[PDB]
Write a protein that binds this ligand. Structure first.
Ligand SMILES: [Mg+2]
Ligand SMILES: [Mg+2]
Ligand SMILES: [Mg+2]
Ligand SMILES: [Mg+2]
Ligand SMILES: [Mg+2]
Ligand SMILES: [Mg+2]
Ligand SMILES: [Mg+2]
Ligand SMILES: [Mg+2]
Ligand SMILES: [Mg+2]
Ligand SMILES: [Mg+2]
Ligand SMILES: [Mg+2]
Ligand SMILES: [Mg+2]
Ligand SMILES: [Mg+2]
Ligand SMILES: [Mg+2]
Ligand SMILES: [Mg+2]
Ligand SMILES: [Mg+2]
Ligand SMILES: [Mg+2]
Ligand SMILES: [Mg+2]
Ligand SMILES: [Mg+2]
Ligand SMILES: [Mg+2]
Ligand SMILES: [Mg+2]
Ligand SMILES: [Mg+2]
Ligand SMILES: [Mg+2]
Ligand SMILES: [Mg+2]
Ligand SMILES: [Mg+2]
Ligand SMILES: [Mg+2]
Ligand SMILES: [Mg+2]
Ligand SMILES: [Mg+2]
Ligand SMILES: [Mg+2]
Ligand SMILES: [Mg+2]
Ligand SMILES: [Mg+2]
Ligand SMILES: [Mg+2]
Ligand SMILES: [Mg+2]
Ligand SMILES: [Mg+2]
Ligand SMILES: [Mg+2]
Ligand SMILES: [Mg+2]
Ligand SMILES: [Mg+2]
Ligand SMILES: [Mg+2]
Ligand SMILES: [Mg+2]
Ligand SMILES: [Mg+2]
Ligand SMILES: [Mg+2]
Ligand SMILES: [Mg+2]
Ligand SMILES: [Mg+2]
Ligand SMILES: [Mg+2]
Ligand SMILES: [Mg+2]
Lengths: 50, 79, 64
RNA sequence: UUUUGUAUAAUGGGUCAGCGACUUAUAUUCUGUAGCAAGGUUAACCGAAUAGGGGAGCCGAAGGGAAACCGAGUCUUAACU
RNA sequence: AGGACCGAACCGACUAAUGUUGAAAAAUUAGCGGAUGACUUGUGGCUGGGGGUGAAAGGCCAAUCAAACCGGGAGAUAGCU
RNA sequence: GUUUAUUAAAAACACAGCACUGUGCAAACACGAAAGUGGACGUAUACGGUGUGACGCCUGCCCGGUGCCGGAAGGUUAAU
RNA sequence: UGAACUCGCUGUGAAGAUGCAGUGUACCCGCGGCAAGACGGAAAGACCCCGUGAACCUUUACUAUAGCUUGACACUGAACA
RNA sequence: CUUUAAUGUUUGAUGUUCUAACGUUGACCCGUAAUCCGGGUUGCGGACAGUGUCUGGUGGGUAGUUUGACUGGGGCGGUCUCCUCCUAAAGAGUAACGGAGGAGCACGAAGGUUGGCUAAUCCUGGUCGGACAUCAGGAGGUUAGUGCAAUGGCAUAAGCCAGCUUGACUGCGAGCGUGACGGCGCGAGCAGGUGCGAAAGCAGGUCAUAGUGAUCCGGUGGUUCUGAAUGGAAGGGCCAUC
């Protein structure tokens, strides 16, 4: 269970965030995705993935 | 060594034929986990993510065998 | 003396128009990352109490 | 009496007479019956005291929502076929 | 002289039989141990219950002791008969 | 010598002797919310606790563990 | 001490029968003896298991606490290095 | 205007001296014809000792409690949740301390879509090279493969390779399956926005079935729901999440 839980934070001013999991030793690079933000109702980038 | 430890709740196999549920899409008319020998005949909507067949709107449920390999399909007669 | 209500159930159940009771679903407090959004969305609303549990609910809540 | 099951060699009783075990109070739900009918009913207390006064209150006639709030609609949702 | 020897009173209780709704809720008969000592006995006094006392056996503390007796919490509780 | 009054009198307890340990006196220790009392009208040749148990010959090795005794270094550490 | 007009054998039976089935034997009633049976008499088995029972005892089980012990403040003051 | 020095002042610590608190179960006198007690004189000790509050350590000396269930009697051993097969008697379901195996994960691509492709094994020929590496052809037609145990599936591929991508989206959801319940599961279709493709279309994670923990208590972010005289705030509620 070395895989750990991280949260993807919307780049917009909204505080909305998603949650997922990722391996730390294999891919330490930050994860960047494009997901729907229900507050602004648009697809935006997400960050903050250790 | 070691015994017992048998899985539980094997779900279900057959849920009906002809106008048994009929109304709406239903969620039966399939042997879950089967796929083989129970395919979507086009008349009924395709499988679910767990290989579950279901209806479109209404009608009788029928079973047929056709096509190469002699596979069995479930269709629904729209009414 | 008066019957004392179960305060644990008074804040768990609420009475509806036709005598039924509404309650909040379970499994929506923590460890939510591995739960499907469909499941959590279906759990978010409130449901009614089943036939078998109404006897216990009414016994617990005499003044509701 | 207890048991799947007892004439059982499973328990109890030597016999007679007397006594001996589902009650009372207050709350709440349902059934029957009586009064009244969108209304029903008073508690303490006063009283020439089972009358009469006393409507403080309580239940019902409107629900939805966590709540603000809205209201035969309300909640969810940016909004719902 | 001796926590010396044998042996009565005196203090014990090793064996056997009897008794076991007894003569007796531990005794009788025949044997047995100590018998100037750490001895035995009369009268009075002190130590009181999670406490006392104990050459120690969980022994004794009014025929009751791995926590005395009397009264109260008290109709303790009993998924058991 | 003592013991289970009332199924066990014994190889069990005690014993004289031996050893360790505490105690400088308002002693240690014990009873007691305290006062106070015993120890003791005693003073280390005394008193208390623990083990062994006349007498004879003896009582070997181990301080890693637990306990006890000692240690102006250093680390951690309460109240304030 | 349920009431008895209270035999043997073989089988049956809640599985070891005076009372059931078949069969054999047996005039009615005492007294003196023996103890094979009436699963004989007494003690709601002490062995075994169970109860989300009890009581004592042990410890590097848990949580507390008397006692002992460390420090700060108070009772508690003044000079010098 | 100082990274720097020193008379004096304040405030801590250590060590000596003092005496007036305090101790005296040292001596003497009085109450008093009294080894108690009190007062007085004196000697010794002395801000120590000792007591109160708070506080760390130790504390079976004492006290209250716990020390599971199944079980071919208990105990020892084993097991307790989830998944696959048989037992299971051709719908579902079905027990034993019955017979056999696995799980308490993994993946930012191993997901989505578009385009393309088809295995194991054997035989013949050929430098190292051979029983087996790579190459060409021929048999064979899934005996191959699947992220992981077993069953059921898969050529259309669910198996293999590449391009672009984040639908592993948000709010709902007619209808249904399975449970005593808590709950779990499948799901067309609607609204918003998005990816692949020329388009029809597909995509609400992975071929499916294991990879999991209720409630309470509390932590983090958002909210303009509440805010005990009023305005705020604290706290609480709601949404996401630990
Ligand atoms: Mg929450
Ligand atoms: Mg029985
Ligand atoms: Mg019978
Ligand atoms: Mg019998
Ligand atoms: Mg009987
Ligand atoms: Mg009985
Ligand atoms: Mg009887
Ligand atoms: Mg209302
Ligand atoms: Mg003599
Ligand atoms: Mg003699
Ligand atoms: Mg004797
Ligand atoms: Mg004699
Ligand atoms: Mg002699
Ligand atoms: Mg003993
Ligand atoms: Mg006695
Ligand atoms: Mg007691
Ligand atoms: Mg009481
Ligand atoms: Mg009683
Ligand atoms: Mg029971
Ligand atoms: Mg002797
Ligand atoms: Mg004696
Ligand atoms: Mg003294
Ligand atoms: Mg000895
Ligand atoms: Mg010896
Ligand atoms: Mg007979
Ligand atoms: Mg017989
Ligand atoms: Mg006779
Ligand atoms: Mg006789
Ligand atoms: Mg009989
Ligand atoms: Mg008997
Ligand atoms: Mg019994
Ligand atoms: Mg204890
Ligand atoms: Mg208790
Ligand atoms: Mg206990
Ligand atoms: Mg058990
Ligand atoms: Mg067994
Ligand atoms: Mg079946
Ligand atoms: Mg069948
Ligand atoms: Mg059944
Ligand atoms: Mg895959
Ligand atoms: Mg393709
Ligand atoms: Mg794929
Ligand atoms: Mg898979
Ligand atoms: Mg305010
Ligand atoms: Mg908040």
């Amino acid at each position: 269970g070395i895989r750990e839980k991280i949260k993807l934070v919307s780049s917009a001013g909204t505080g909305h965030f998603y949650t997922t999991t990722k391996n730390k030793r294999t891919k330490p690079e930050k994860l960047e995705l494009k997901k729907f933000d229900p507050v602004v109702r648009q697809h935006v980038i997400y960050k903050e993935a250790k | 060594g070691g015994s017992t430890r048998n899985g539980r709740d094997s779900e279900a196999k057959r849920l009906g034929v002809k106008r048994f549920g009929g109304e709406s899409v239903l969620a039966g008319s399939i042997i879950v986990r089967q796929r083989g020998t129970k395919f979507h005949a086009g008349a009924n909507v395709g499988c679910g993510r767990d290989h579950t067949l279901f209806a479109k709107a209404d009608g009788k449920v029928k079973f047929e065998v056709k096509g190469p390999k002699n596979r069995k399909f479930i269709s629904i007669e729209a009414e | 003396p008066k019957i004392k209500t179960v305060r644990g159930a008074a804040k768990r159940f609420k009475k509806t128009g036709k005598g039924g009771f509404k309650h909040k679903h379970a499994n929506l407090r923590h460890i939510l990352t591995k739960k499907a959004t469909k499941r959590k969305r279906h759990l978010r609303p409130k449901a009614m109490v089943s036939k078998g549990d109404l006897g216990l609910v009414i016994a617990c809540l005499p003044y509701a």
